[model samples]
Target: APDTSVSNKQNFSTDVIYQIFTDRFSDGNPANNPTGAAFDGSCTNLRLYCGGDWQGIINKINDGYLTGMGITAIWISQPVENIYSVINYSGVNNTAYHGLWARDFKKTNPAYGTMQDFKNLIDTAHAHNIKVIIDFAPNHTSPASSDDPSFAENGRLYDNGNLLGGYTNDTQNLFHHYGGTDFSTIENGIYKNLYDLADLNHNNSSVDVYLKDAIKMWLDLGVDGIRVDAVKHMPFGWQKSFMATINNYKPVFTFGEWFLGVNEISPEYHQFANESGMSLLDFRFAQKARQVFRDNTDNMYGLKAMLEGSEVDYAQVNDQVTFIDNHDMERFHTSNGDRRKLEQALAFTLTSRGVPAIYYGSEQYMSGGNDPDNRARLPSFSTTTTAYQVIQKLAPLRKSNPAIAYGSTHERWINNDVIIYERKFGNNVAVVAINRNMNTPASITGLVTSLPRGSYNDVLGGILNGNTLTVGAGGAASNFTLAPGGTAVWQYTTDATTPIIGNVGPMMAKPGVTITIDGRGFGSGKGTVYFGTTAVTGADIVAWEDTQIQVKIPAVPGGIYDIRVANAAGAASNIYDNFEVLTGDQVTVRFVINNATTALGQNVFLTGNVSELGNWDPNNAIGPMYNQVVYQYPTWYYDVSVPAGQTIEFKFLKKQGSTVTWEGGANRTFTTPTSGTATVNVNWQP
Candidate 1:
């Protein structure tokens, strides 16, 4: 047989990655089930584990289901031996369906399958051209029990130890505890008590070697990459060395589980991981995406800021894994009632810059609440689920289209209810319009006009148009309303005759600036340039001949914005940004708190303003409660209210789910806005 190790450098712009929890994916054999384990297949007590195994996944691959979806890669759970006996701990309120706890890395858990079965699964997946990435746990293993020896009886550190005290010689010394209680102290270490998995002491040289050997063993077994678990808990030096050693053996694509928010997990750490030879999971994007989908608010500006503030290098950020809902967090479908919103989210993830990974059941509208609930069993393929089909469509679209797979992203429009953006590379481009509102149609303008000539295809709506196109709600005809939570993917040739600029008019917002051009073709849907210099990219650009090209004005900067166009035929027109700049007189006001309430863990919504309300319209805003509610925007700046305290400074919220820069100010308070007195409506829930 030829050397068939999977390739690491994927044309991520063109591949769709699917994640599978091996334990809940499928079960091919009943004999592999652990004895004395409780198994009930009912909806009420859904926490109990149902049988899903490696063989089931292998079956799917062999049957062509995975390959059919254009899934280039498959990520499975940790295939090592998990806790032998199912521990019954009711306090946490969930079953062990999620395979985070492992007993031994040397062997495969009988409940999942034997070592040979896992090998066969990988081999079969490869046969279908689907690469395999296995999950690797380096931080900890299952607690000790009579059934398993790798586990130690002594409790692991980090879970309950104090951060300020440092690592003590006793229980405190064994692990580093998370610090603080209220949101203020969260980054310094305070957090909710959820994770109890035994933390492995990497300080032990023997333990470090053991983990390194285990990871190498899997690499030898022929996995394309590794999804490192709890990467932050492990020492940074150790992570760099461990990953370098693995990459030395063979080109490997590894992603660390760095769960810190936008600015919380310092860019230096992310840069270290990337330079150390491993990619990172975009947890910051995930956190913000959840908020956008759940609250249905204008989060584009915040999301943009989060992406910009990402301390990690931009090149690395583009390669990071992007997802909407995953195994650990709350499911989007459950958090938000609209499935279309989920679909739109999918569209955004696939089209955005990064290696996109779709959670297995995200397309089928799978609903999970918290951690364990979020890790539900994979659904059967022989159902009415459109998730697989959607993935199938997206896989090829991403793989074939350069704009979607590898393009520069520019925010064309951003508001409270609608978000529109474009991705362009060379001559290819993709436009994504996401509407958070469930009832109203989101109207977005100023789309980048950059596309080839000829009729284009709308993948989601199945409609075809030449220059201009509009997507209505629920795939409706003629109307521009996008089905609440809907998304569309449109494609066209670059050399089309008609330009895409329609009744939208000139790109300038000012008067007395007339612009015209004589070219081979001038219409909507073709590339256009402003001041004839800057290259315009979008689904609506108007392209002309090699000498002359005309384009509609998408947006003008204050005065006279210039224009031009570029495609395979070459560049035309030399536009510049010499337009008049307009500066508006608007006062920016942020919140401040002097005396804080002591009600720890309680969410407090802060409202009121120092300056009088100007021309800002509250009725048109998403959060009617105050001028704006933070819940709609899940960036580091949002989701943060004053923690219970006497005095605190209110700086823009940083990452790590904690607010910062609190300097003690004066004590001032205001009640929630009354229905009549308030310009916007308010809704607060505890």
Candidate 2:
């Protein structure tokens, strides 16, 4: 698919997104909740609805609950129509209020609100610069049937590519009933019935077209991003083709709802941006951070492993959605309900490498055990909640600092009780430290950082205190402490950045040729550089470091391309470009032919004393001019490469393979650039 001109924009990277489970979020529309009918709205029955409506969500936005907290975006659950019932799936009675069991992708579930209400929510959010990310389900519809009062049958795929009418278990159908997704490994790639929900065929093109059409309609209505459901169940090809449809038009931030953190992330199965064109939740990063900062089970070392592992496994590391409690996962405060621990968990996410995703109610230290409990109805917000104060400050902290969102990360110090990591983008730097010791405060001296010598203020100190620190010439921050189970985050501004390209080696090569990039400000982290439009993924990368990069070129058509070097942070290089891929011995030469009149189906050639210029014969010379008629009328230049230091007198001639035309002027003379490997700037004749 044709990728659009979206390379200049990035929305998902460095964002602090708020995830809301619509059914439990609010009740702006009381009419949508009628005594817990169909989908229960009574909070008494946790499995059913809790009176949350799209209008309810809009009320929160209108009230400034989201934008006021400095949150940049909201990711709501799927709002599509869903089967209404308390069905048994995975041995639990559940209703569709959770917004997962979509019956129709095109219609908004009335329980949520009318499509107009949905549009109103987006409009309100956009006014606050808060984007709306809609959760889109493509895996399967509600089960066609269940074993009992559960779901014995609902809608199924048929061999003829039709649903609701086709026989289940047809091998050639579009779902797992037809032996589409493998179940042997279970969570390895695909899940068993995926909570008894029919599994969509991972490689079905027709199914993809159906899903894409539904999503585009919402996109047409101005939804900002997409949250893809059940990505682990889809084939890589399916994921790749699916995203190609959206990315080719609008650069919508997209991610899959893949769980089972680091260990089972299955990067080999799902791949990266090039494969899926979407991000995966950093389950391992969130889990490790949660365990160390909340449960205190492991330590900083474990958290370190998760961060490094995530950087290695993910392609776009900057946008790897990081979170603590999601609907399916247990609440962060479930184990202890300790407010201090909750702050640490929230702080870790806010300062981590990837984008921070705060589950609704987690900021208020909401406590629930698992599943339904974790996905509880929203209670009134209290600024009094200690954890809420921390999140309140961080909401805008990330929004203001470009370094926090677009910087390289490195481990500064880590121990069982205390850990510190530093992020640097350009000359700006931020240091984040988490302390687990409850009674005793964690302190460190002369912590090494990338910031220059200076005194600075901890941007978050108003909430925790003890916020001033100084950096020495040796680039170390001295005497910083966390108030016993607290978090300390400090940022410094300067003028240095990465992606300063000094030069690139192997100036000319074919598509398969390997090349080296020499520059500064690179990190040991994974780098993403492009030879023009083709991205050099894992296989193309030979080595990466702070000052250099090596990669084999992807297959591109013969031309001169910019060696666009983007470091670990997605910040690209500003200097040293133009790597040439050639089809013949002669390279790009500068040949100016001003005052020449050539029309369509025409070429500009050069005839000079040099043998390379067709030995002074206009008929045999083969070189083309960069059509620059738009710059100035009657101007053209031939791009040809001549041998080193060769002096030549040449004039331009135009031909259309049959007619030859020469400029009406004396031969223009100039020395061939000594660096035969280098091509110079050219302006068509005046």
Candidate 3:
């Protein structure tokens, strides 16, 4: 059979993800349930295990509960073996049912299922055209206390049940000893534990090598993606190396969870999403959405500002995983709140940019607070709820409409209560107008879209009071009344007139790795795929289709480049930027040069033997290096992704316009660390 989706698996923009709290989703096999204080079949004690397992998920896939709701992918809890100890914390028993307290990286959690059961779940999901994404919490092991070694297995780590080290042990230096973090500086948090959880020292060779081996095992099991937990708590460079391992082996879609609070904007957060090799959960989008749609603390203009600002901030906004709420937050739906709010949020998220995810039970209108409350057992399997119908109507559009999956957003009209946005890519266009005010109607005028002239009905069939749209010539809609709490979607899609590149994935990789390009108008006959201006053809163009292309990246210099496609007819596509060709398997390193004085127009640039460093060519040198807030003048610095563990020769040069001056001495040399980040500090070789 052909691929179920026209999307690159490594680019999940074309699919809608359903996040399932594994222990709360279902219980297909009761035999695996944890016994005693740790078990709660009724799920009244949300902190205890509730018996959901891999077999249960398989049953859901086979029974169509998920597929019926248009779910294309699922994000499950960490499947690794967790501690069995039921620790009494403040007089209440807690268990590893949440799957964050890891005991062994190399084995499946018995309470979740056996290895065979997990394989069955993956196979069933694949058969149903669903991708499987598992949460991986590599930041720590089981919770522990240094003063109390008898508590909860001492947060000990194991290799397939063989003990590696414990938090109390000093010989191996596997865990950090610093006290809990206050969430101050990034560096401070990296070396300290979070609450009582034992922090794994990624710098330790045992911890580093074991984790690399562990992820490989899951990739071999045919998992489609990974959700890295607690990314902010880990060293940024190590996470990049982790992503490098995945890209270098069997590349899959990977995203990290980096929490951001309400109305918070951080440049460091933006840089992480942009440069980390892995993309991140759309926390900024989620928080702003909550404020505007749920809490009513913000307005439509706030929503628009977030949309516009995020586009500029993240290099690959489409790759970010977007959600209304998740396991960590209060459910978007409230018990007594207007259901229209939840419905509108769902409608908006599905049509907006990025890969959308709906927390389990969201379709059922489940309501709860944070943590255990948000992770409630899915309340129902009914497909008749209004929210379920909303998802059913819109989720499939992500798969069927390229505009919804890969379009650039433009606000056609906006006010405090209503906002109309249009998404356009190639010949596809989707326009959505949402009125958030529950009690006031708005007269929408002068709204224009790229949609063709016609009368289009609400895709939701007016479930949220959406009205018909009469579009005239020039794609202008006649003035119409937008009902209070109304959300209407109208879209048009046709074959591409010219080649268009929507997305490519495993965005960072070594040359020769096969990457999938997903878009439209690429003829069935092989066309030219370009990494920068260098074109690849023939055997490297492994396969070709109108909507998808599978090709190997040519051996291009290691740096960021725009990807373009030229059809067999020589018509070129729109440029898709930020594709990174790695020097080899990579680790991010910060290169610092002190006392490199430069003239007003001259800037420092580094050139080295490796492709990542431009193969010693001044023209391809990295930078014009930075010398701003992070460092002062005469102390320029730049963070570069370089080949892991390789020694390379490099030199600094000053360039202004066409003139270049090389440093006066012999080339400097450095070896990159295999896992975490390293800094290369040197004086200018004058």
Model 3 lDDT on a 0 to 1 scale: 0.87
Tens-place lDDT digits, model 2, residues 1-686: 00111111234554578999888888888887734344565576688777788888777877777667768788998978776666665776667777777667777788789889888987887776678888887777765543342343455432222343322544555555533334454332452365457666433335545676677787787787788887766544345445544653454677777667434545443344323446777777777877777766787787787777766555447657788878768787865456767777787778776768989998766788777778878776765566767777776766455567656678898778888898766667788876777789777876888777888776667465436668887887667666676667878754346565434444444455556564455667768888887788687887777655767777765455787777777887764444555332232254444556667777666676654455567764645554432123355543344434555677667788678877665767765543222333333353
Q: Residue 26 in model 1: shift from native, Å?
A: 1.5
lDDT score of residue 646 within candidate 3: 90
lDDT of 3 by residue, 1-686 (tens): 11236234577898999999899999999999999999999999988999999888888888888899899999999999999999888988989988999999899999899999888888888888899999999999988887889999899999997889888865888888878888776656766788889988775667878998999999999899999999898867568778878988888899998888998888878878887788898999999999999998998899999999988889889899999999888989897898888999999899999999998999888989988788879877887999989999999998788899989999999999899999998879889999999899999978888988999988889998999899999998899999899889998879887988777788888888988888888887888988898999999988888888888988876778899999999999988898888877876677889999889899999989987678888998877676753467889877666798899999999999999999997888898876655778889877
Clash pairs for candidate 3: none
Worst 10 residues of 1 by lDDT: 619-628
- Error in Å for residue 213 of model 1: 1.7
Q: Once model 3 is optimally superposed onto the true structure by TM-score, how far is the C-alpha of residue 180 displaced, in angstroms?
A: 2.1
Report lDDT (CA) for all predictions.
0.51, 0.65, 0.87
Better of 1 and 2 by lDDT: 2
**lDDT (tens digit, per residue) of candidate 1 on 259-302:** 76533546655554444346677877777776676654536676
TM-score of 2: 0.69
CA deviation > 4 Å runs, candidate 2: 1-10, 34-37, 88-93, 146-153, 156-174, 178-183, 186-192, 202-206, 261-274, 335-337, 480-482, 494-686
- Model 1 clashing-pair count: 62
